[PDB]
A paper describes a structure:
HAPLESS 2 (HAP2) is a conserved sperm plasma membrane protein that is essential for gamete fusion in a diverse array of eukaryotes. HAP2 is homologous to the viral class II fusion proteins, which fold into an articulated rod made of three β-sheet-rich domains, termed I, II, and III, with the central domain I flanked by domains II and III in the prefusion form. Domain III connects to the C-terminal transmembrane domain via a flexible linker, while domain II bears the fusion loops at the opposite end. The crystal structure of the C. reinhardtii HAPLESS 2 (HAP2) ectodomain (CrHAP2e) revealed that this broadly conserved, gamete-expressed transmembrane protein has the same three-dimensional fold as class II viral fusion proteins.
The experimental electron density map of AtHAP2 allowed us to trace 446 out of 469 ectodomain residues, including the region at the tip of domain II that was disordered in CrHAP2. The resulting atomic model of AtHAP2 revealed a trimer in unequivocal postfusion hairpin conformation, as observed previously for CrHAP2. A similar trimerization process occurred in the crystallization drops in the case of AtHAP2 and CrHAP2, which were also set to crystallize as monomers. The AtHAP2 fusion loop features an amphipathic helix (αF) at its apex, positioned to interact parallel to the target membrane by insertion of its nonpolar surface (I171, F172, M175, I176). In the case of AtHAP2, the structure suggests a different insertion mode, as the bdc β-sheet is retracted from the membrane (blue arrow in Fig 4D) at a distance incompatible with interactions with lipid heads. We found that the soluble, wild-type (WT) AtHAP2e migrated to the top of the gradient, in contrast to a triple alanine substitution mutant in αF, which remained in the bottom of the tube, indicating that HAP2 binds membranes and that the bulky nonpolar side chains of αF are required. We found that D173P, but not D173A (which is expected to maintain helical character), reduced HAP2 function in vivo and reduced the ability of AtHAP2e to associate with liposomes, indicating that altering the helical conformation in this region affects membrane insertion.
Author numbering:
A (entry chain C), B (entry chain C), C (entry chain C): 25 to 75, 87 to 142, 146 to 263, 273 to 493
Write the structure that this text describes.
């Protein structure tokens, strides 16, 4: 937490146009509140002059998350299946004795559920044998039955709309020996406490240097209320789905699309049943087995999934990993202000960077730091690397004197050839002066 | 409008490196100007000491809009149509007497406009009858003619580039009994008034908590210069279009794509003519008939379409529904400053929330508020709901003492089952203290 | 550079909970640092009172760029080619004497590399002649061989992740006649200089009015380590690629997709080989030949490609053309502060606007300006146009007294018909007062 400005201003309240206005001199403060503040790192003490204990203010800010406004579209099956039935005489208006596993649903009769009969032999959809003339003359002409059924798991298809940034700002005030809590957020961004002495107003946020995804042209697939919890949750492009169920080889095929097919008995098996949810889940599994980031699945690429307050099953939100400075304005009924901050030295314990692939993989530099002081203090950490590795953002954090904090950085090299780099981790305190420096051996595999 | 800081600073102008510099002490102010301010809610009076009426400043800000830089690509038809002609002898180089409605355009001859002849009978593109041998021996062999024509409406295809935020900031100055207007925006963000006494500079905007769409991978279709005005205006994905006219079943098909088709007489009717503008318009109509938000059409999902100044037919902009705090800096040639704000009580008249579907629909809470005071004053409104409903952003507005304002909130429940919730609307004044509280019965349909 | 606030604040450092805290009164400054500042335009002189040369501070800021976190997916060929071989007896397990250019790769044997034999004559994939019965009775039955090979150039397919904003802020301090440099950026945003006298902290950025692309659903194709340097670099939609190599007519086709084709000998030539990298490169060439902006190619639409520090071949970044105000906080160990800015008059030399097409093209207004003064000073430029042309953002720049600067504006008309417009260019100094006005004749072609 850093004070942007301290200023004295005479605020005058007006109630009637004809009547007289009453004034009151207040002390307006502009604050930059970063995400992760607790209050135990810095305090703002107010000095009041009357014409006995001074009021102390401590500001706490929670981690940020991005909530996405979901709109329900239509239910979709996980694995649509095509069944082959090698029998004798075939007809779409047949019984289970000659169609076996195919059949037809009567939930009443459905003309699109009935199977399609194709001739026997090779070059056809299903390769079979026509048999002999004498077996054909009694049992009937050999035919293959093809049907579309939807067994197994089902998924919800949601449309990602606007993205909403959410958090909570706790303002603690000590008039004497008694505490008063003020909760400020995007939902409730204006508050007053203890007989109009305090005025907390949330103006906005100071622009970050890392983007938050919008997921504009994507749909979210949620399993109906094997693999991990959010690994089944996928973000797939809108063009990949067939909401009308009239398009082939797209997520959400219908019976009408499959039955109305160009050259059904000539086209290969499993046609009109390609690029489904199982194909996209399997492509992630193959990528995860090779120890790489998934392309569609949520788990692995996003941090803190659905860990937001007032959560639900049909709700989607991702954690904002970047530290954001939130512009807060505290307007006090005092004469002046004193800013009391806490400082405590710290040391870098050990940096753990594992060996990773040339460009298919990225680096993770786990840096654990201990507070060697006696009081809870603010900290800064810069992770500088060689010409090959791209710049990494500075990390802000508050460590208790009896605790440790693990801080990881994503390392991105620009070279293809297996090269050796050197990284220097610089730790700073509430005072922007360096407390400890550390080096680490870094190398990639071709 | 809220004052971030008030500060005295000695500004010194330099003209020559060798020469002497002249100083002047000025009073710099940092302001957070929200969208919707008029000036009648708060005033900033300057106190000048010389070695008679004080100058009063009032700042007005307009509602925000997002303008999209459109680039013309190519014209596209609304409904491309395939015509069937059941005749006798067929040939692509035939006359209108034996091709009827098909024919060919001579705007000169066009080899891609001529129809394609297919054999008679079933299993073909068009189901017909071959007739008898004796009718065939005189009139000719029976054939079906198929042709591609483009009748009806046409549309413009534009590429959405960068998004530009636009608004206007009016700065009113009263030196005596005479007014002076200063218009500040992203186009003109630096101004000075009345012999260098005033200095208005627009630094930037304070980060909002709601996203504005970019429409990156989308194209805008505009009808050529039934349905509503902007309901015909659609935002469709770039992959859905065939700008080259060589791809089948994509928006903007050509004659070449249709003529060069795999197994033309074997493939079903209306092939190469799927997923066109009419299919996307019809899918919106079906969604609107079921009282749900459209997927492609502009009207229904976006507020204030093309209501921006300096508008045109080949221009696109959407209104920014979220209130944005604009960072303005007023630098005055005075000794000090007095901030005179207006306060007027208000009461919640009635909350109107209609019953809506489980997840296919969202809620709208119409809250009408009256200014019970005597002067124009600023207001705040928080709409808190149960654990199931997600957080809604705080609304800022200015109400005249002889007027009312309707304020609607979008309600998003997280549960699928028909549940009953309770919502509490809290109204605040220019003073962040609550003026009126109101409750409402809330329930959804399964 | 503009001072947002100047404030005196007593900062008190705490080391132990039981122990006593030491105070120090500091002078906190809030600054809006725009991109392009050098230091020679304005200086901030500090006045220190002790109980001899004053410290002078000059702040320089570099131009901004947006860096995209690339993740490697798979290699892709530029032009996959299908070869036709008109021979006699054909078989997939044949020798080079009867398959000619087709053959098969043995890098060992590959069952998917072997060609496919199709019957002779018309209506087939390749139109040929079956010859005579007597030529067939000795040489063999006539057949056509079809094979898929990947000759020529190859490309890298990268997944665009998060966007990171990068720049550098230089803080120059003169204690006496000796200089001290402080480099502040998103990587290192906290610094202290000359025995805790200076405290530079980077809070964030002030919201711009122009968007920066995210490229969410796009992939970047880079040629393997004719056309320009970055013209071969393309941004193509994720749906356009077939990473699995199982889909036809999509970027990155495999042998399996081509061999497993519906009615191979019936379908037209070059099938399963459509919509490849060469098709997208050619569509840009045709657009560039007609003097229009490319759709996929990087060069032409984006400014300053890969001109960022710590660059590489597998790195992607675009220059931020919009001027951004960066919120910097300088906290000094002094009693007061004096702001000394430089002012120098300037004149508009000549405006060069070429005649362009109705809506397929956009305008470029090259405005060259000279500093007629004696010292390096800040400048402002507004380019107002008629009702038809949309609003253009104000441009900030610093010109040396012995130099000139060319400033171009993108002009977007809203009318389709060839109309004549009038544009007024207004130049301003460090003082927001107008120095020079200029008009220009403007017209478009239908
Ligand atoms: C902020 O306060 C909440 C309780 O209201 C607490 O759970 C949270 O841990 C505090 N923040 C920090 C960073 O300690
Ligand atoms: C703001 O409103 C929310 C929701 O009603 C509530 O939880 C919070 O405590 C409120 N803040 C204050 C300071 O009362
Ligand atoms: C701001 O001023 C314009 C006239 O310049 C006026 O039309 C507008 O209504 C004013 N804004 C408000 C919120 O009253
Ligand atoms: C800023 O420029 C625009 C366009 O020329 C104009 O409408 C506006 O009045 C200008 N503002 C001032 C303060 O002159
Ligand atoms: C800022 O300083 C660097 C050297 O550190 C210099 O190259 C650059 O030109 C300076 N910026 C400007 C706008 O002059
Ligand atoms: C900040 O860190 C970077 C990388 O180590 C370095 O180049 C820069 O000079 C540092 N800034 C200061 C003020 O030391
Ligand atoms: Zn038998
Ligand atoms: Zn569910
Ligand atoms: Zn498949
Ligand atoms: Zn007859
Ligand atoms: Zn038009
Ligand atoms: Zn259709
Ligand atoms: Zn011969
Ligand atoms: Zn390479
Ligand atoms: Zn092609």
């Amino acid at each position: 937490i850093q004070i942007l400005s301290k200023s004295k201003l005479e605020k005058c309240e007006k109630t009637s146009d004809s009547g007289n206005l009453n004034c009151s001199t207040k002390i307006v403060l502009n604050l930059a509140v970063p995400s992760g503040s607790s209050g135990g790192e810095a305090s703002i003490v107010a000095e009041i002059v009357e014409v006995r204990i001074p009021p102390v203010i401590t500001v706490n800010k929670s981690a940020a998350y991005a909530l996405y406004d979901l709109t329900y579209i239509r239910d979709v099956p996980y694995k649509p299946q095509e069944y082959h039935v090698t029998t004798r005489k075939c007809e779409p208006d047949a019984g289970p004795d000659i169609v076996q596993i195919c059949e037809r649903l009567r939930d009443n009769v459905l003309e699109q559920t009935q199977p399609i009969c194709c001739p026997c032999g090779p070059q056809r959809r299903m390769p079979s044998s026509c048999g002999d003339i004498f077996d054909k003359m009694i049992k009937g002409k050999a035919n293959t039955a093809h049907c579309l059924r939807f067994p197994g798991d089902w998924f919800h298809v949601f449309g990602i709309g606007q993205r909403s940034l959410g958090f909570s700002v706790r303002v603690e005030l000590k008039t004497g020996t008694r505490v008063s809590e003020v909760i400020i957020g995007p939902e409730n961004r204006t508050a007053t406490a203890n007989d109009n002495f305090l005025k907390v107003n949330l103006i906005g946020d100071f622009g970050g240097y890392t983007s938050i995804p919008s997921f504009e042209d994507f749909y979210l697939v949620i399993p109906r209320e094997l693999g991990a919890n959010y690994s089944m949750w996928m973000l797939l492009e809108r063009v990949r789905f067939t909401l009308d169920g009239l398009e082939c080889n797209k997520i959400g095929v219908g019976y009408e699309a499959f039955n109305t097919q160009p050259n059904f008995c000539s086209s290969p098996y499993w046609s009109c049943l390609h690029n489904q949810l199982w194909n996209f889940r399997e492509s992630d599994i193959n990528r995860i087995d090779r120890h790489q980031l998934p392309l569609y699945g949520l788990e692995g690429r996003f941090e803190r999934i659905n860990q937001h307050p007032n959560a639900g099953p049909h709700s989607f939100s991702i954690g904002v990993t970047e530290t954001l400075n939130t512009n807060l304005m505290i307007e006090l009924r005092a004469d002046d202000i004193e800013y009391v901050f806490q400082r405590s030295p710290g040391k870098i314990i050990n940096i753990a960077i594992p060996t990773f692939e040339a460009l298919t993989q990225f680096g993770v530099a786990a840096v654990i730091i201990k507070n060697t002081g006696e009081v809870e203090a603010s900290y800064s950490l810069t992770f500088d690397c060689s010409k090959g590795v791209a710049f990494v953002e500075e990390q802000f954090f508050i460590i208790k004197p009896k605790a440790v904090t693990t801080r990881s950085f994503k390392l991105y090299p620009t070279k293809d050839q297996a090269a050796k780099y050197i990284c220097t981790a610089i730790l700073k305190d509430s005072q922007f002066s360096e407390v400890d420096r550390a080096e680490c051996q870094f190398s990639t595999t071709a």
